[PDB]
Amino acid sequence: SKILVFGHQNPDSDAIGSSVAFAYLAKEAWGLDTEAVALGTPNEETAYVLDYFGVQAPRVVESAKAEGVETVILTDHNEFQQSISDIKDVTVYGVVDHHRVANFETANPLYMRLEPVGSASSIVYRMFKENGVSVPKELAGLLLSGLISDTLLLKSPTTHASDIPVAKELAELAGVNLEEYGLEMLKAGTNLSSKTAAELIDIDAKTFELNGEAVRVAQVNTVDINDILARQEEIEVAIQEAIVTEGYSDFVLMITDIVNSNSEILALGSNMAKVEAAFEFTLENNHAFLAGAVSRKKQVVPQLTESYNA
Amino acid sequence: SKILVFGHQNPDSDAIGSSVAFAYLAKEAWGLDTEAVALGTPNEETAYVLDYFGVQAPRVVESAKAEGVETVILTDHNEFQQSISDIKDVTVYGVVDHHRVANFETANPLYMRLEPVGSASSIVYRMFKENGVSVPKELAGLLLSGLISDTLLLKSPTTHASDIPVAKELAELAGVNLEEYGLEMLKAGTNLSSKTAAELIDIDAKTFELNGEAVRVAQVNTVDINDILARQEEIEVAIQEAIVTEGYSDFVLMITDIVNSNSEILALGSNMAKVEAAFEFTLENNHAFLAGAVSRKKQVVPQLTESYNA
Numbered sequence: 001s002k003i004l005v006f007g008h009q010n011p012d013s014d015a016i017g018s019s020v021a022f023a024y025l026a027k028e029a030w031g032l033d034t035e036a037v038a039l040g041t042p043n044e045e046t047a048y049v050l051d052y053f054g055v056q057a058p059r060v061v062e063s064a065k066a067e068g069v070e071t072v073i074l075t076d077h078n079e080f081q082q083s084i085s086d087i088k089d090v091t092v093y094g095v096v097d098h099h100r101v102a103n104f105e106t107a108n109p110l111y112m113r114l115e116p117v118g119s120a121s122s123i124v125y126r127m128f129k130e131n132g133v134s135v136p137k138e139l140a141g142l143l144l145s146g147l148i149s150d151t152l153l154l155k156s157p158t159t160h161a162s163d164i165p166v167a168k169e170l171a172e173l174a175g176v177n178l179e180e181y182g183l184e185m186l187k188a189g190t191n192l193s194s195k196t197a198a199e200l201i202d203i204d205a206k207t208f209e210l211n212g213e214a215v216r217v218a219q220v221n222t223v224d225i226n227d228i229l230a231r232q233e234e235i236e237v238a239i240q241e242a243i244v245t246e247g248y249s250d251f252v253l254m255i256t257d258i259v260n261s262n263s264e265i266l267a268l269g270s271n272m273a274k275v276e277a278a279f280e281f282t283l284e285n286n287h288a289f290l291a292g293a294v295s296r297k298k299q300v301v302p303q304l305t306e307s308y309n310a
Numbered sequence: 311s312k313i314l315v316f317g318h319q320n321p322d323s324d325a326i327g328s329s330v331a332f333a334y335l336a337k338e339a340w341g342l343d344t345e346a347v348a349l350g351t352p353n354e355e356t357a358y359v360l361d362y363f364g365v366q367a368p369r370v371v372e373s374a375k376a377e378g379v380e381t382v383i384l385t386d387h388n389e390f391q392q393s394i395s396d397i398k399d400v401t402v403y404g405v406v407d408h409h410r411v412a413n414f415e416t417a418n419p420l421y422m423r424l425e426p427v428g429s430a431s432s433i434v435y436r437m438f439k440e441n442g443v444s445v446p447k448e449l450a451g452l453l454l455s456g457l458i459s460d461t462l463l464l465k466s467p468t469t470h471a472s473d474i475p476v477a478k479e480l481a482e483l484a485g486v487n488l489e490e491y492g493l494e495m496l497k498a499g500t501n502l503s504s505k506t507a508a509e510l511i512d513i514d515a516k517t518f519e520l521n522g523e524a525v526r527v528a529q530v531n532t533v534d535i536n537d538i539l540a541r542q543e544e545i546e547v548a549i550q551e552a553i554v555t556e557g558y559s560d561f562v563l564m565i566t567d568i569v570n571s572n573s574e575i576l577a578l579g580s581n582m583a584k585v586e587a588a589f590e591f592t593l594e595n596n597h598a599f600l601a602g603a604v605s606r607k608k609q610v611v612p613q614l615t616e617s618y619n620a
C-alpha cells in the first residue's frame with residue numbers, strides 16, 4: 001500500500017533532506033512502502049548539496065492521483081495551502097515538522113512528531129536513533145545540510161541547544177568539517193545572477209492565509225543587500241504581476257544578508273499598515289531595514305499573524 | 311514559568327491519567343513547572359480508579375487567566391472547542407493526543423506527539439521509557455486504567471498491537487491482574503442510576519463542528535441497552551433542552567453495551583438524513599441499532615465528518 005513522502009512547495013535543502021532521509025527510515029524500521037518525492041526543482045543551494053554527496057534530486061510529482069496514491073507523509077510543513085496540489089482528497093498518514101500549525105485537518109488519528117528546533121532534519125536524525133537504524137553516510141550528508149541551511153550554520157534564532165550535538169555527530173558521519181562545508185554550501189545559495197526577477201521572488205516563497213487575506217512571503221539569500229536593491233525596478237514589476245495573477249492581497253520580500261544577519265523588507269499590497277504594525281517600521285519607497293532578522297518562521301509569520309488579527 | 315496540563319472537557323479515565331502522569335514526567339525529565347489540573351469532576355469510573363490507587367482527583371480549573379497562566383499542555387484532545395474555556399489567548403506548549411486533528415491552530419512551532427493507538431496514556435508511558443524515568447506504581451495504575459477504559463479491556467477497534475506489551479508491563483507495575491481489575495473498574499462506569507437524564511447525556515459528550523453545524527455526540531456505558539431505552543422519554547426531554555439552549559444543530563447518543571460490543575443510536579436535530587447516511591440505517595422512533603460499534607473516534611466521527619460534507 002504505497003506512500004509518498006515530501007516537503008513543501010518551493011522545496012528546499014531541509015525540505016528535501018528530511019523527506020528523503022525519512023522514506024528510508026520508514027522502510028527499514030517499519031517496512032512501509034514509502035517513496036520520497038518532491039514538488040519542484042531543487043534550488044541552487046540544494047543542487048550543490050545534492051551534487052556534493054552524489055544523490056539524485058527526487059522526481060517531481062503533480063498530484064497523488066496522478067501517481068495513483070491516496071496516502072502521504074508530510075515533512076517540513078503541514079499547512080494545506082503549502083502542500084501537494086490535491087491534499088484534501090488524500091489521507092495524511094504522518095507528519096514530521098518544525099513549524100506552527102494552521103489550515104490542517106484530518107478524519108482519523110495520525111502520527112505527528114513536531115518539535116520546535118532548527119530544522120525538520122534534526123528530528124528525523126534523532127528518530128533514526130530511537131529505532132537503532134544506522135544512517136548511511138550520504139543521508140548523514142543531506143540531513144546535515146538541511147540543518148545548516150535552515151539555521152545559517154547554527155546562528156539563526158531557531159537553533160535549539162538540541163541541534164548542537166546533532167551537528168557534530170552528523171558532520172562526522174558525513175566526513176566533512178562543519179565550519180568548512182557550511183560556508184561553501186551557503187555560498188551556493190547566494191548566487192542570484194542565474195535568476196530573473198520573476199524566478200527570484202519565487203526561489204523560496206510560501207503562501208499564508210492571514211485573516212481572510214492571502215499574503216505571500218518570499219525570501220532570498222545574499223551577501224550584499226544593494227545587489228538586489230539595484231534590481232528594485234524589475235523585482236517590483238514582477239511582484240505586481242504575481243499579486244494580480246494569483247490574487248494575493250500583499251507580497252512581502254525578505255532580502256536577508258546571511259553574512260551579517262540582517263534583512264531588507266520590500267512589500268506592496270492593500271494592507272501596508274498591517275505590515276508596518278508587525279515591524280514597527282516605515283516603508284520608504286516600498287521598503288525598510290530590519291536589523292538582525294533571518295527567520296521567516298520566528299520573526300515574520302508570528303508578527304503578521306498578530307497585526308492582521310489586531 | 312508555570313504550565314497547566316489537562317484533558318478535554320467532560321474529563322475521563324484516559325483524559326485524567328495521561329494528563330496527570332505527564333505533568334510528573336515533564337518536571338522530572340526537563341524540569342518544567344507543570345501542574346496537572348482538570349476541567350471537571352471525575353466520572354464514576356475514574357472515581358473508582360482514583361480511589362483504588364488512592365490518588366486525589368485534580369482540582370477543577372475555570373480559565374488559564376483565572377490561574378494567571380499563559381502557557382498550557384493538552385493531552386487526549388486538540389480541538390479548540392473541546393479544550394479549556396480560554397484556549398485562544400494562551401500559548402499551546404505541547405500536545406500529546408490520539409485523535410484526529412481539527413479546529414486547532416498556533417502562532418509558533420510547538421511540540422506535538424500524536425500516535426494512533428488505543429489511548430493517549432500508552433504514549434505517555436512509552437515516553438516515560440524514552441527518557442529513563444521510572445514510573446511510580448500509582449501512576450502505573452492511572453495510566454493502565456486510561457488504556458483499559460479507552461479500549462474496553464483491549465478489544466475496541468482502536469487497540470493497536472503496540473498496546474499489548476504496554477498492557478502487561480503496566481499491570482505488573484501496578485500490582486493488579488489485568489483481566490481481573492479490568493472488569494471491576496469497567497463495572498463502575500455502568501452504574502447509571504446515580505444520574506438523572508440531564509446528567510446522563512453529559513457524562514461523556516463532546517462538541518463537533520461539522521461543516522457549519524454544531525453536532526454534539528455523547529456516549530454512555532451499560533450492561534443492558536433496555537435500561538436506558540426504558541428511560542427514553544426523559545432522556546429525550548433532556549436532549550431537546552440541550553439543543554435549544556446550546557444551539558446545537560443535532561444531538562447523537564451512543565448507548566454502548568460493553569459486554570457484547572454494540573450500541574444503540576438515539577438522535578434528533580435538523581440533519582437527520584445526514585445521520586442515517588453515515589450509518590446506513592433507519593431511525594424508528596428516533597433510534598436504531600448499530601452492530602459491533604464501541605468507538606466514537608473510529609466509527610462515528612469519520613462517518614459524520616463524511617456525510618455532512620457529501
Ligand SMILES: N[C@@H](Cc1c[nH]c2ccccc12)C(=O)O
Pocket residue numbers: 030032073093094095096111112113
Ligand atoms: N509505522 C511507524 C509510524 C510512525 C511512527 N512515528 C512517525 C512519525 C511520522 C510518520 C509516521 C510515524 C511506527 O510504527 O512507529
Ligand SMILES: N[C@@H](Cc1c[nH]c2ccccc12)C(=O)O
Pocket residue numbers: 340342383403404405406421422423
Ligand atoms: N521540554 C521537553 C518538551 C517536550 C518533548 N516532547 C513533548 C511532548 C509534548 C509536550 C512537550 C514535549 C523536551 O525537552 O523534550
Ligand SMILES: [Mg+2]
Pocket residue numbers: 012150296
Ligand atoms: Mg526557509
Ligand SMILES: [Mg+2]
Pocket residue numbers: 322460606
Ligand atoms: Mg471516550
Ligand SMILES: [Mn+2]
Pocket residue numbers: 008012014015076
Ligand atoms: Mn523547509
Ligand SMILES: [Mn+2]
Pocket residue numbers: 014015076119120150
Ligand atoms: Mn525547514
Ligand SMILES: [Mn+2]
Pocket residue numbers: 318322324325386
Ligand atoms: Mn479521553
Ligand SMILES: [Mn+2]
Pocket residue numbers: 324325386429430460
Ligand atoms: Mn482517550
